[model samples]
Each structure stands twice: as structure tokens, then as C-alpha cells.
Target chain A: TEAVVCVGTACYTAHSGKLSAAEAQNHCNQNGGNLATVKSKEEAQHVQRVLAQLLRREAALTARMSKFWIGLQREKGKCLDPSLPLKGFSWVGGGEDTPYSNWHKELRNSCISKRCVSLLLDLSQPLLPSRLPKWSEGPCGSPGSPGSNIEGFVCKFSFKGMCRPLALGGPGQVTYTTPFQTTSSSLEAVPFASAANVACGETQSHYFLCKEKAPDVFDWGSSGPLCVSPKYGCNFNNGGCHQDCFEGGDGSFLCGCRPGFRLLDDLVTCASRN
Target chain B: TCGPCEPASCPPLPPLGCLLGETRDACGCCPMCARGEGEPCGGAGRGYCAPGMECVKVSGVCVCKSRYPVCGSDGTTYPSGCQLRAASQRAESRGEKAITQVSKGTCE
Candidate 1:
């Protein structure tokens, strides 16, 4: 989640050691570069991928703690500032720059203290998008404190983590399973959606699986621990029936059938066929 | 009907603040906000933009000029009868100066 759009320039103005976004941009301009602007879906995907990777390489670098700035600007889509009487701020990028500037116009700077590029997060969840997208020029330090080191200016997209279904070997870790014999309907109807919801706080080392027989019922909970990976369809690919669930709770799913058991429509039944 | 009537010049008007929502501004009226752009507001002159907004002939819709000093941003209003298209015109003419100042880190 920590990504900065600055064009590789780390120059940032600090207040008692923290910098504001405008100050950071000014710092960059003074050094000959501007904040980096993401121009394509590929770039967005890159950010998502890198973030996923970064999160794995280091445990401390998750989105919950590190907040970085992105290059998306606050000017009128572009970086141009044309209304100044004598000398006013020039938008760093040209008209072409506005397409990727995600911030809505009204949310741009309304006062002298407002920042052009800042990090915004939902105050309640701190992970979801803050609809308001409050702008902070520098690292989003704790509100009244300066140089808190909690949030700061880092190269945009440099410190990144991966984004995935979270079931298929997420950043930290995951378990894979082997595919077993089952009807196309039973395998396809496997409820991974509910399992995904249960895995929200699950550890990679811990197995999160489920076995569902009906709409509100599951056979096995987290007890199966985690099925081994690469043996089934749950790893990097989603082909046959591969699911993860928890044990003995409102959330869980199971695919493994005891030696004599076979998977049937909505139920793991005794072998009906040879 | 007058035999020889002179058209009256529109006066300077207040500007609108937030474009995302239906809010009042210095300008008596704002550009006609279309669906998706934001909520539409009434009191616009002739069912058209008040001052800082321009009415498109075909769509009969008003668009806020990019240069309209959005309330707290610039704190400047438009001259009455001003169309939204012309909002940024004045600013563009002085674009060079604004660029210079901002580049050097100056605020106007």
C-alpha cells in the first residue's frame, strides 16, 4: 500500500523532519525531476504486484503501518497553475498528466496549507479508501506530531506488496492441495467466497479449509489444517475443485474425502459408482 | 418593446465552491450539473448557467469553467453574464506568470 509517484526524486521538505507533499514536489522540481505519474493499467497492476511482493519479503512492511505518497496530482487533472498574477505554481506535468490524476477537482487544495500530493486512508478502517481522501503533503504522521516516522515520503511504488485472491499463496504463505475425484457440479460449487472471508486474519502456515454439504452447513472445519499445495487446483491455478476453509465454525469448507468416501452433489456420499 | 434599446452588460457574479455537490456559491448560479458530474441545482438563470458555467447549445447544459476560482481555492468570482467556458480564459492568458511563481515556489 506504500507507493510514491515521485519521479525517483527523494527530495522532500520536512517540518521538524516531516515534509508536506507540495514541499516534496518543490523539492523534486528543485532537483530537476517531478513526481512520477502512473499512466496505464499496467502501471496500476505493477503497483499491486510489487506491493504483494514487498509485503512478503518483510513482515514489518505491510499496508497497515507504512503509508507512502503516490504521484497522482491534485491540480486540474493536469499540473498546470495558470491563474497567478505574476508568478504562480506551474503544474509539473502537461495536459497529458491529468488523465491519471485520480483526485477529484474540488478536493484539490482549497487553502494555502493544503497539499497537492498526499496519502489518504479511511480513518475508521485505515485500510479502506477514505472517500474524503484527505491530503497530506508529507508522510501522514500522527495528526499533531511531527517526524513521527510512522508515515513518510518514500519512492512511489518502490516499497510494494502483492495483491492476490489471498487463497492462492498470498504474500506471507499458503498451502496447496491435490485434486480428488468429484462431480463437476460439486467441485465447481465449492464455496471459496465464504472461505476467503474466513481467511481474513488466518496465517499462511495455518491451514484454512472447509467442507460444505449444503447452503449453511460444512463438514470439516480448520481441523484438516491445510491441504498440501501443488497436489490440487488451489495453488497458482483455479481449475478443478480447490477450496480452503476453517474447522468447527460458521465458516469452513472441505474437499478431501476419506479413502472410501466420494464427493456427490451437495454431499460427500458413499461410492455410488464403481 | 423599446424602439432603440441597448442590451445591458452582465455584472460580475460570485463563484461556486464545490463542483461535486449541489452547493451555493458567490455566483448567483452555477453551471448546469449533469447526472454523474454531480447533482443539478436550481436558480440558474434562464435554466442555464448562472455566471461561471457555460450552457452548451446542443445539450442545453452548463459546464463550470476550469478557471472558476473554486471558492476557497482562489476566492474570486466571475463577472455577471460570464459563461463557464471563459472561466479559465483569463487565467490562461496569465499562465506564464503563474507557472513561473509556482515553479519557484510562490503563491498568488
Candidate 2:
């Protein structure tokens, strides 16, 4: 059976069979994925849970072998694949160094040749607590070897078709002003270099501008102009109108007047002149 | 017939780049800069003013309040010393990552 474990942007699929580290990468690649790279503690636990579930489902298989392959290997004192000539050990996905690791203390410092990492279901314990599997390293491609053998591997792929929020501005709309300008409804003209991330939100039925201090760090301003809207209202200076308000087909609005009258600064009231 | 008034929530804006002497407001709504020469400012997210203005540190008055892409110990960038402190306060508030500044730059 094919089991898929999805967590956030990552999706893990564990196939119940054996393959060497290189062979395991091929297996994952064949399925349009790569061997799971545990980027966080939560991800590691998720992969462990999936492995436990797969192990419990196969009764006869439980009687067979208990070890499997993961996408981790050791190199000059670093936990990564040794196959690459990139000087230091790195992940297979982008050859980047491992940002997270869960190596057993004993094997944490042990960097030996022909050695690869695998997740093993402790044969000493039963299936009740299946998440107890730990990280152990052994000779790569030696499935028949005792204790260092492998039988299956986990494949991980990022989730697809996820919905992302759109950017603040619409197609064409100027909603800002000069730097540190004292205006009731004008955005500070922060230079592109000095500006960080854009922070946008709504209030009083209008959109306002904000700034991000750092990545994922937002420093919203206390005041700014209303994001231009399709409807004419006080928030947007009555949609910059002088008279009657009418929503146009494009979600913006247009000001109008009676047969012989013109719009005025008062917005609602009309006049006979410009 | 009249209806409920729903605010026009705008879509999130794209991340720009980086800024100096910038901060946010209480609602995290706008990007406020350090208040001008005589402007009042203080507290987190609230705007700040350049040092040496009238009543800069007046008690209960509007006062001037209070990194190289450096990766903090918690796997986030410190950016600078001030941001590192901010990150430290946040980490402390959340009961995580040591607030100690590890190095001058990112660990990774």
C-alpha cells in the first residue's frame, strides 16, 4: 500500500521495500520526489509516525526486517551525502548543508566511509510504541548485512497547488507619498532600498500601507492612506469625487452630476460649475 | 436596505527589502519611521524620534524609545543588535531559544 503523510508544505510517502542509499534516491526520483530531508523536529516526528503506521499495517512484513533507509549520510564530520564532490556534506535536494539533524549521540561524531543513515524499528520492542525508531548508520548498499541492513526508504515531496495570498496593490494605483511627509492620507515615499517588506491591512473600509523590518517581521505604521477601492466612501475621500458616487465596472468608482450640474469638493452636493 | 459594514481587507503586500529607523504600530498596520526631530515616539512598534528633542525622556510623555543577515541561535537572522534584542525578547516571551548573541553574523 502507498501511504502519504503530508505536513505543511512537505508530503512524505513510504514504500515498503529495500534499496541502497543511491538506489533509494533513484526510487524517490522515479516517483517524482527525493529521499526525505528532515528540515525540522516536527518533520522528523512526522516521518517517524508514517513509518510506524506502515510497519503496523504489514503483519507478515513485521516478521521480515525492521530497518529502512532515510536521506541522510555522513561525511567529513558533517551529516550529509558523501556522493557529491561539493567539499562538504549536503542534502540531495539542493546539496545544501543539513539545517537539522537527529543523530544518536554515539553516531553523531562517527564519520566512516561506505556508511549511510537509516531509520530502524527497534526489534527489542513491540509495535505498540512505533515512533521509538532511532537514527542508526551502517554500511551503504549492504541490505544483507546484520544490524546495518536496509529494507525500505521514505520519499518526500513538497505540497502542490497551495493557495498564496496576492500582493497589496491592484493593477495600477498610486497610494504613497514622499518620505516623512505630514499628510492625512499619504504614504511615505520610502526609497526602494530603504523599504523592507510591504505590510498591508484594512481599516475603516480601506487598505493602508505598512513596512516589514525583516523577513516575516512586520513593523506596521500607525497611519497611512486608504488603499484605493471601487466604492466611493469617506475613507477614500468619497472616491475623490465632487458629487454623486457610482461604482464602475472595473471595481473603481466615478463621480457624476445631474443634466446641467457639476461635481463639487463637498462630494455629495453638486453645482452648476467646475 | 442597509447592510453590515465590512472593512475592505487588502491583500498582503510583497516583501520589499530592508529599512533603517523604521517600525510598526500597535495594530501592526502601517510602516512608521523614526519620528522627525520633534516628533513623539516610544515602545515596541510605536514610532521613535531622533535623539535630543524637547522632553525626549519626559516621564509619561511621548519619549524617544528605544544585522548582516546573521542567523541567530534559533535559526533566524539577528540582522542587527537591536533586532537581536527584539528577537531575544520574543524568544523569551515564547520560552524558547537562548537570548544570548552567538556571533556577529549568521550561523548558517
Candidate 3:
């Protein structure tokens, strides 16, 4: 959870601001950016990973109190228009449209006033795939309200430079998987905040987060907490397994063990019968 | 002769939804069903066997040509699928439960 993470041209930051929706927007503008206009699935994917990392790094005390603001808002006197996909809302710094909206419910925005969108982040449990972070519309209340439900907000900016891919001169193989769901054995121009996994052998795989340190500068400078690689089936190098690999429902996998052999405690290792 | 083939003189025809398919009666007036294997036939005004069965003049009864047995939903082992279908037609003609070849082999 470093300072800023950029996918393509868009970069986002989770501010430590206990500010209101308007204040959050001001904060991003002060930093030469704006409240993120996360209008695409790829952008949401990047932000979701960023928020999850923040949940891990930050304390639980501040985690539960508030939500981060995005650039979505329903204009005053505009009833929740079910006709529009965004329910009569528009982006703040960008435009009055979006290609994606992850509202929690067909909320009670019947006929009424000003409301903004805040991302629901929780530390009570692991972020569920079935129920990832959702946007909930509430009062665009002033800063430091009773519960102060605005712990922070996400700030968006565009960087002119990107990172070059990492290279290690060892016998290991390096693979980079970007946040936008692209993988490369050797990336010509690596995107900022992409992850790289260098695998020499079993138990020798290391993962690093690709970050651009300065303008037009890049390195595999930091290590990510876990491997963010895509789910490749057995067809891909036999799922990188030695014994057997099987595909299960829902793009899942099941490692097979022979009759005379057993799956070891490592789960990926197959052991011969003693 | 059994008089002319008159529609009014024929017995009430079986339900239109015949399980084993329909056929013209011996009278050639109403669509009707025919007898199954081993059923007496041929000495009447007009004899008709089920579609898959033959009216055997020597035995004076309808019979299936193939004797390989088959299992039926009626819990009876028929001499063949043809016999089972003939049974189904006969049963449907009388408005009794229809027979169906549930499996290929003989009933155990």
C-alpha cells in the first residue's frame, strides 16, 4: 500500500483525510488531481486491490468509521432516476456519464436532494469476491459528523511517465501480470503497479509489485503481499504441476494424486508411497 | 358378410391419443386398435393384428415374429418390443393401462 498506484494513465491514492465529500474533492484538487472518476471495470479492479491493501496496512480503528468518496453524485432536486444507469448522477471532475456503477442496492433515493457515493470498506472480514466493495449513497454531510463516516477518499491523477519492466540475471523466469488482466513473459513497456513473479523452482518463487519511482523511471522496487497472477488451467504448463492437475467448476483446479502416492502437506507436492 | 362398413354400427373408437398409433378398423370406418400376440384372431368378420404383429393363419392368433423378450412397464416380459407394443395397443383399446417397453432386455 504505497503512496500512489496507477494502472494506465489513471493513478489513484487513498488519502488519510477525515474530510467530507466536498472536502475530499478539494483535497484531490489541491494535490493536482480530483476525486477519482472510476468509470471502467479495469479502473475499479485497480482501486479494489488498492483499498484491500489499505485495509491490511491501516489500523482497524479508522477502517470501520468511514468510507472513501468517489466522483459520483446525484444532483439536487433530481429524484433517483431509475431510467438512467447511474440513477441521475454524474462524475465531478470528468463528465455526466459512466460505463460502470456498483451501487449496493436500488437504494431509497426516492424523490430528493444532494447525495454522493462512498465506497464501502470493511476490516471486520476478508473482502468477499461475491460481495466486493460497493458504492452506497448517503448524506454529503460536513466533515467530522458524529460518526465521521469519511475516513478517507481516493484521489485520481494522470502521470506522464511509466515504468520499464524488471529483469533479473538469474536462472529463474520472470513473469509480469498487470492489474488490467494482462500477462507478459517480457513486458516491453510495463505499466505502473503491475506485479512480477520470478520462479526459479518449487518454494523459490518471489513476487514484486512494479512501481515507477520517478518520471520515466521504473523498477520492481517493492514486494507485494501475495501473488496476483491469473488462474491458468492445466493446459498451461500442466498448471505448473509435476504430478497431475484437473479443472474443476467455476474455473477452479484440483491437483490429482496417484493411487500409490499422496498429496503432501504443501498441497502442491505429490509424494510417492512409502 | 358383416354388412356394410358403417360408421354408426362400429363400437366407440379408442381415444385419439393412441399410445401405439392408429389404424383403420376391419370395417374400415373408424380408426381402431388391433389385438396383441397370442390373442385369438382371423375367424371374425374381419381380423387385424397390431402393426408389428402378424395374424398367423396357422395358430389363428396374432404373433410377434421375433421371440427375443423385452421388459415392459406393465411388469410383463413380452416376446419382443413388437409384442410389448401390441400389448400396449390392446390395453389402450380397452382403456386399460398402456404397456411400454421400459428396457431392452427381458424382465428379471
lDDT of candidates 1 onward, in order: 0.30, 0.46, 0.60
* Worst ten in a row by lDDT for model 1 chain A: A244-253
Q: Which stretches of candidate 3 lie over 4 Å from their true place?
A: A63-66, A110-112, A128-130, A146-148, A165-274, B1-108
Tens digit of per-residue lDDT, candidate 3, span B10-105: 677444433333333333334344454565554334434444454555226666656678999988787788867656766865779978778867
Poorest lDDT segment (10 consecutive residues) of candidate 3 chain A: A222-231
DockQ of each: 0.01, 0.02, 0.01
Q: lDDT value for candidate 1? A: 0.30
Per-residue lDDT for B1-108 in model 2, tens only? Answer: 223222344223224211222322324333333233334443333343322121244121222222144455666666555455544544544567656666666666
Q: After the best TM-score superposition of candidate 3, give how far the Cα of residue A170 lies from its true spot, in angstroms.
A: 10
Q: Could you give candidate 1's per-residue lDDT for residues A1-274 as a string of tens digits?
A: 2221211211111111245455544544553444433344344343433333333455353335343344543333333353432112223343343333333234333333323444433323422222323323333223344333324432221211111122232223332221211112111123222232222122333433444445545433431123224333222232122231101111111222222223333221223223
**Candidate 2: deviation at residue B13, Å?**
30
Which tens-of-lDDT digit does each residue in B1-108 have in candidate 1? Answer: 213222243322225321211211213222122121111322213222322333333234444444332222233333322222233333544452221111111123
Task: State the TM-score of the second chain for every model.
Answer: 0.22, 0.34, 0.53
Model 2 segments more than 4 A misplaced: A63-65, A75-89, A108-112, A123-132, A142-147, A163-274, B1-108
Q: Cα deviation of A237 in candidate 2 (Å)?
A: 49
Reference-based lDDT, residue B62, model 1:
44
lDDT of 3 by residue, A219-270 (tens): 5653211222224434455444336543322122323343334443223345
